[PDB]
Ligand binder design. Sequence first.
Ligand SMILES: *[C@H](N)[C@@H]1CCCN1C(=O)[C@@H](N)Cc1ccc(-c2ccccc2)cc1
Ligand SMILES: *[C@H](N)[C@@H]1CCCN1C(=O)[C@H](N)Cc1ccc(-c2ccccc2)cc1
Lengths: 726, 728
Amino acid sequence: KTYTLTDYLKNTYRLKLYSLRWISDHEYLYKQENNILVFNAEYGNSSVFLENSTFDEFGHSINDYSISPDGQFILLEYNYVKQWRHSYTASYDIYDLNKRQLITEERIPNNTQWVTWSPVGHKLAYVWNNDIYVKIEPNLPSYRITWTGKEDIIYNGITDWVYEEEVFSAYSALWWSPNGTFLAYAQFNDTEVPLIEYSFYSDESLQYPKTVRVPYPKAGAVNPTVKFFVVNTDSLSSVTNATSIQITAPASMLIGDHYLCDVTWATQERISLQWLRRIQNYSVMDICDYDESSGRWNCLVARQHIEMSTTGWVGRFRPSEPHFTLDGNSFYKIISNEEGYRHICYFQIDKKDCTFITKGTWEVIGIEALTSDYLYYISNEYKGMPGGRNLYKIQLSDYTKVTCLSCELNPERCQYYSVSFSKEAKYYQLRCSGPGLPLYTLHSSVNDKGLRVLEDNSALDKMLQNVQMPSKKLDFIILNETKFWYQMILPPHFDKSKKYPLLLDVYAGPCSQKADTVFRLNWATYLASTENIIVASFDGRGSGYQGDKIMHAINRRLGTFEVEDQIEAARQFSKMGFVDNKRIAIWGWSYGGYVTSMVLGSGSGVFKCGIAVAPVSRWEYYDSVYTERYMGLPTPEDNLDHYRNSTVMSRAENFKQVEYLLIHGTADDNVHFQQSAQISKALVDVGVDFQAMWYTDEDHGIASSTAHQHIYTHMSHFIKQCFSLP
Amino acid sequence: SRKTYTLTDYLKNTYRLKLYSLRWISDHEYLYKQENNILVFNAEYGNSSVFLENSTFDEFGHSINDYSISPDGQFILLEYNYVKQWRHSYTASYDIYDLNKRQLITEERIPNNTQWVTWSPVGHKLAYVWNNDIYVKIEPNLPSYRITWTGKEDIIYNGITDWVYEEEVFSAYSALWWSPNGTFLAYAQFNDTEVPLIEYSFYSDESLQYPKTVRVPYPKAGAVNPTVKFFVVNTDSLSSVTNATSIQITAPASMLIGDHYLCDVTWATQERISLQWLRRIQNYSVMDICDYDESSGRWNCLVARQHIEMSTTGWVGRFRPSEPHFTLDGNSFYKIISNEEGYRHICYFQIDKKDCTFITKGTWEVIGIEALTSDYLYYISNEYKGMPGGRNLYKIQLSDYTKVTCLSCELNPERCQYYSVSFSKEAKYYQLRCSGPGLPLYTLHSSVNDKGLRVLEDNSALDKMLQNVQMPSKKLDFIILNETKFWYQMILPPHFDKSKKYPLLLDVYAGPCSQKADTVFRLNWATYLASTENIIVASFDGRGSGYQGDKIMHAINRRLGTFEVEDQIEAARQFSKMGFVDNKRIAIWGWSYGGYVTSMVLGSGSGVFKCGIAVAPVSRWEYYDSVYTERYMGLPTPEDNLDHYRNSTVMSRAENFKQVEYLLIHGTADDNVHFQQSAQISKALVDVGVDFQAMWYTDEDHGIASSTAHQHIYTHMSHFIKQCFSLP
Ligand SMILES: *[C@H](N)[C@@H]1CCCN1C(=O)[C@@H](N)Cc1ccc(-c2ccccc2)cc1
Ligand SMILES: *[C@H](N)[C@@H]1CCCN1C(=O)[C@H](N)Cc1ccc(-c2ccccc2)cc1
């Protein structure tokens, strides 16, 4: 048989994972059914750290727990109420693991926006009603740390909309120091930030549609401001209002609009912060130390570091994070070479110049672990494949010595990895995503020897061997010297003679990679396996993990090359002899929906049909942080001219020659529905027919169970009909 | 080869229908635009003259979209900067032009952004509303008079209606009534302080970075309705520095007892004015004849003169209580009221006397009173040939009811069975307007000997053009159901061979007192579908439809979403029963109430229809405005009609769509039928796992009538229809 839409939708073929949480450097927690066993990394044996029963009766559905470092409590999260992409509120309850008695006194508020323990011990810090509260003991009263919170105005401890989504990629906005002595946080002011407003219809019972209003800054609009503070969580009394010490500047940032882009504690008395100018090609890092007697925090200018650019923005999406040495005196952090390839550089806190410890036409995806003799990192060097992933270790005393921890384990099924070390990189869990089926192994850092296999996904392999699964070809093509990768999901019993319809799956956003060695079971799977349709992807100009030459090829010019190279890919794929020139479609979501629109509106006759889901249409309608970063400001003095040059509706006319399907959630807080409405309006004015579909109350993810299922069913029909498939 | 009526012909309106819109400025003359310059006409002899010349307001710097002559012909109201709001309400700029001195007035100019403005029934006075306030200008060059100081956006309206009174009760933005004399200016005052607001986005032009949220005082079923007060001021006692005194006319005590509405205002004399009030439960209504009193300058309304109008079978009136037409002295008036047998006829009232006398009866209804003279009473009815879907002009002698005469029945039978009329100030002359079933014909006449003066337009140009195009024919007939006959019409293709099996599209509306079956001549989408796609387009008037008596119309009282839906599926059933229908290709479509019905029918799971299109429909009545919905469904409270309110939602029938192709369409800026309505339909469908086709229209309202939107939406439905009928 074959992999169908129902399989995809009904998740008939699930991939097993092995989610574990190190609680120490020798132990880790792992959910075994309705039990939270605790394993021993060495002998790998376990024991029920907590029985499913324990938390029995309690008229509330519990979703995800959180054991304190002390292991003396396990805050229980329930009543989860999804907000933005990371934010959400829930009710909480602590439970003493030794008194088996659920806390009752001072219990954490309801509608909590975020909680978290101290890195060690059982200190609890939480945000409520936009204010910070601190608990030294689960059963003892909380201490107000802030008194300025104000729903969607003043945010203390939690990011505002754009900061969570495009900056800290998190809701949380507070960082505990190593031993829980200091509690740091940022403060966001949205007062002058405009609000995007949309209707939310809700349950049929609702008589009047509701209006959601979110402080959301669009390109060139008034941005939110920020303040950083640090409060000593030991000087707090039942009387004094914990005095928070602020950390301002740098003056090079205060000269105007800027953002806080990173918080990284170096030591128990030293914290690092990176600042980014609205024009994101200049970043400043400050390393501040606690001044014993004085109580304030000082950031020696001798210790600040400038990370600027002249061919684009800074970082892959933001100035990378620092990974400090144990004594917080120096650090390492990915930065761009003089050659354009991001590599690990070594800094001395008060030494302006760093030394690249890695180099070459490949790049470091990130720094995973740091010990006194080794720096563990992931890169895409191996086989010279930007789309592959591996764990590497480099000797700090000799950069010439760099061993690849994963590369050879099973070169067959594992060319993409992820790592997870213990409390002191004594052991680490290797996580293979593919090209084969997920494989999780446990190793020892002192020898890197494989302790055992935690999960081989044999159960799946079994089932999958009875399904006409599709195949996957990951290779490249060349354009003007440089080579650009791409991947094709091929139908079962592929035949290079027979011509197949081709569906171009695209995202093509700045620093993206739709071509990798990861094993995925999705809609493309069904299309290929059941509709014998080739689903391809191509990472052209603007894509990441190949040096700035590629990734910055679209600086201040979104909707140019990424769009062009996209057309070229299909343009050549056809010239491959197994593609039906007359049956080539293109589809994408978000940025991918934009490029998909720009392309179907290019008029290259190359495509027959295309689908754009939750697409951007005019960069001025998208948030600042993300947009300006590639486009600058929509001012005539800056880039307003190109901003206006890249709109989807400017190419409405050219839609007459293609078959278009536009879809969009009405509650999209990210890429506003307004975008897609502005598009349809353009097609109506020009006289271009096309199909549409809006999804009531769904956001950017159009992920609700029924919503998700419906859109894939619809898009199917669209595609199968466009390709004349039974 | 011979062509057909294509989509492009209807969209690009290639075959145009000549009109002839007069504008009686007197009982002897009328204004007519020479499509470049308006001129004056003499009804008597037919000779004309260039009243206002195109080459006059040039270099104006702006364009005029509507002129407006004064009652004394001494001034001409110029209108520019027009900006549409709702169905009738709009705003614009104005200028006064002296026709007696050919000079645009430059003093005390009418404000910019004016909401409404009308002359005086006589002379040349002016009453305009700016910023929700009423102002008066005795002379154009002179300053105005602030009649009100309570005006305020979305809260207090003085002289203009708020969204619901505009669309549902009055069907006009205006809320001021001059006294036939001109000395009196009566006006209404609406209060929406607590009326919930319907909010929705308006994206505006691409350059709008952040979408704008439109907030509107709109009461949904059972919500907090607006309140209202009445006033009458003396435009003679104005001339001052002091504030205008505004007398108020309250009660009736039978109306103040609870929520209610002001539904009609008609002056009777210079010192008499009649007001008709409606209760929130629109089945009871009072008529208050109020007489002026010079003694106290106040207005009184002797309860001894009220006329109650209630209905135990439904609501009062077709859509609201009918208007009264008063006699000379104003002690008597004629009006439409359904008689004890259920039909609407003309009843004679003498105020002081009880009950009224019907001067008309029969198994047909009086559509409307057009003119009242001391001599006769002219009206429109569907008496002729017992065709409910026919319309003719009659005249009944007031001194002997047996002397009824049809003024339009025989004029041109085979060609005209549907007429509308337009009289002069005292109806010395009138223009009949034959809009069916043949080519639109326009005729002018004299009341005296009812002579046929002449022809103003007989579309002989279109007629010639339609002689090289395969036009479809129209079949108007009926069928019996439950021993009753219900009419239906079909747009049959060219050479309609009863042998073949044609695909049929059921065009529906079926709203309360609606009528989709008539003798009217039309050139629309159906024309194209039948002519080019050879599709049979039919409509059917079932229970709840109008112009056939209350037994039928009130059939759906307190039961919207029942019989009218049923009778629809049935009609279809009965059509494929005639043999020239392909059971495999039966579709259905409707706009507004038509979408609702089209949705409910596709949701009844009868499987009779393959596909269906629903344009901006209603999904559940609690979503519609009170005035309308309530008049049929009552109150949505457990204590009244809530249950059925919950039973008639399209949403609850989602699962049954699994067996159909549905095309859902709505303008995102609809203020009438909130987009929210289709937003819920689409959501319930998605939750039951039903695939369907949707299409939203950015910034379009209930009409989806822009030039680009109109063509786009129709092109689209034509694609869906054909697709559904498997035909090129
Ligand atoms: C489509 N997916 C759209 C196209 C415009 C950008 N899109 C988004 O949805 C971005 N907000 C996606 C995004 C969000 C966050 C990060 C990020 C990266 C690194 C650190 C923190 C956050 C990247 C991309
Ligand atoms: C669709 N066409 C929808 C159907 C629900 C009501 N809709 C409207 O557009 C209007 N609210 C209908 C309407 C009908 C008739 C009148 C009217 C008022 C006064 C006298 C006669 C008719 C007003 C509004």
